[PDB]
Amino acid sequence: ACSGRGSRCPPQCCMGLRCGRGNPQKCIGAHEDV
């Protein structure tokens, strides 16, 4: 199962998210421009 907004990739972030690089890595939202 994909990653959620708080976990890195993989698991590849779920629909709407993107893998936000950094340490610790964490997926964030692509369509989250706020």
Q: What distance in Å separates the CA atoms of residue 34 and residue 31, rounded to the nearest whole number?
A: 9
**Cα–Cα dist 3/27, whole Å:** 7
Structural domains in the chain (count)? 1
User: Cα dihedral sign for 15, 32, 6, 8?
Assistant: positive
Tokens (6 digits) for 33: 């421009």
Q: In terms of Cα–Cα distance, which of 28, 33, 32 is closest to 9?
A: 28
What are residue 25's phi and psi, to 5 degrees? -60, 150
Q: Tell me how the structure was determined.
A: NMR
CB distance 33 to 16 below 8 Å: no
Domain that holds residue 26: 1-34
What residue type is assigned to position 15 of the chain?
A: M
